[PDB]
Structure 1
């Protein structure tokens, strides 16, 4: 895959999960791009077997597409949770996540998950961390 392919797979997965389908116009709306650009990427994703077109349902993810898709959403949400946990201003988070999500190895994602769990199981840790920043 590529960062762009992942940006699209993530968005398509989100729409199907939210609406039950992923229309070109909806994808174009979420990414602020022309539908023709969407169709070009969809053709590529079809060629690479991440999805297929079904007569009425339209765009449908293959098993490969759904598995990766769910993990891309996982990554995005974990990174948002990570930044939120360490005190980053809410207004900054989405921009930072989108800027780094496609450039962080899964090993790093794995370790970040352990870091988030670390603070999740004991608020005294979040308190000690917070005492460092305001200081």
Structure 2
């Protein structure tokens, strides 16, 4: 059962490089009853995540765009993170997948400050690799 968050992420991609999002497209990528999209897209509208453009179809409001873009950011940030601390590229996605839906934006924020702490220079992120060689 995809989350209101999964939709917005999904509805985001289906809009990003697929014009706009049609209720059938959702019940596709998310792989769930096409009536579960209308049931949900109903609450998404109520939550100001998207409005329905007569004739054109569903589109995200600045809010939805915001929430959606932030989700995308969370995924890449977590991957950058796992990778920057030196984790088997193979694992990166695996772990990020498992954890991403279980972390507060507070952690996602401090993890950014963490990724920051390093990325700014290849040296400081070396000492990390030096400790890893044990």
Task: Name the TM tier (shorter chain).
Answer: 0.7 to 0.9
SS of structure 1 residue aligned to 2:101: helix
Change (3 A) 1:115 1:37: same
The separation in 1 between residues aligned to 2:2 and 2:35, in whole angstroms, is 19
The separation in 1 between residues aligned to 2:5 and 2:61, in whole angstroms, is 15
Gaps of 5+ in 1: none
Gaps of 5+ in 2: none
Is the contact between residue 2 and residue 30 of structure 2 (CA under 8 Å) also seen in structure 1?
no
Is the contact between residue 53 and residue 59 of structure 1 (CA under 8 Å) also seen in structure 2?
yes
TM-score, length-scaled by structure 1: 0.83
TM-score, length-scaled by structure 2: 0.83
Change (3 A) 1:42 1:85: same
Alpha-carbon offset, residue 120 of structure 1:
0.6
Query: What is the count of residue pairs matched by the alignment?
Result: 134
Alpha-carbon offset, residue 82 of structure 1:
0.8
Q: Which has the higher contact order (CA 8 A, sep 6+)?
A: 1
Which protein is richer in helix relative to its size? 1
